[PDB]
């Protein structure tokens, strides 16, 4: 999972083009993870409404891409950089680690949907690496 200089450069270049859509990406991605993978909904069950484009999905999606924005900031050491987010997801919430891959996948789909021209195979390998690193670093506080 170690990210190369090429991976970091690629992810940061991609983030430079996409980041003004970060709220829309997060919203569209959370929405889809919950509808397309309904088993993730058990984590959000206290929410009034979990449906695509709803008030809570939009508010939370911003937060979630704020977390990805945070990781792009911390890309040299995600392990420390996402420590608080690990505490919350792994230790408090006990999110099953299989769901991180799902949200990662949903984010890549929405980025590809939104920026088809930007999202080459090359952007795709490095963003997928970065997302795995994000996913590992979020798993730090299980055990």
């Amino acid at each position: 999972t170690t990210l190369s200089d090429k991976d970091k450069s690629t992810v940061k270049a991609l983030w430079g083009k996409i980041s003004k859509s970060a709220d829309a990406i997060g919203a569209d991605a959370l929405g889809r993870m919950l509808a397309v993978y309904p088993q993730t909904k058990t984590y959000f069950s206290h929410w009034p409404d979990m449906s695509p484009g709803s008030g809570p999905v939009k508010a939370h999606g911003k937060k979630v891409m704020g977390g990805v924005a945070l990781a792009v900031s911390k890309i040299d050491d995600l392990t420390t950089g996402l420590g608080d987010l690990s505490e919350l997801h792994a230790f408090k919430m006990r999110v099953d680690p299989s769901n991180f891959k799902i949200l990662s996948h949903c984010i890549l789909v929405v980025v590809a949907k939104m920026f088809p021209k930007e999202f080459t195979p090359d952007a795709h390998v490095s963003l997928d690496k970065f997302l795995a690193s994000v996913a590992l670093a979020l798993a730090e506080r299980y055990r």
């Binding site: 889809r32 695509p52 590809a112 949907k113 088809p116 195979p121």
Partner: protein, 142 residues
Amino acid sequence: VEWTQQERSIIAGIFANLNYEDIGPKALARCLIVYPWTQRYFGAYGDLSTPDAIKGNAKIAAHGVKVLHGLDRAVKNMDNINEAYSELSVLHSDKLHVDPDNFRILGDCLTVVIAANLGDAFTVETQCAFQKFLAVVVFALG
């Protein structure tokens, strides 16, 4: 699975829209580039060294198109993908022993390509039905 009519017609809708000559090569190439271990199964398909070379590869490209024709066959058989896929399953699982996680991973690659291509036509509803569909296909392959 237990398809509603809306899912049947969404799924048939997706594959009526797609040009498989464009989608197939892209999706398979992307699988090989993003998950290079899958290159192991394609030693006979010539040049896989760099990315630029993967995309330029006519044997990989044609094989991506056959994978879409494979899928299309599953859309013709939505209530019996198992039976319709038996020989594909003998081929991927009994002969080649592709780990089931790989079918998942090319499924994902395909959904990423289809998403880039369809733009606003790739609704939430569309992906829900598309994934239900790929989940039947990968279970049939394994």
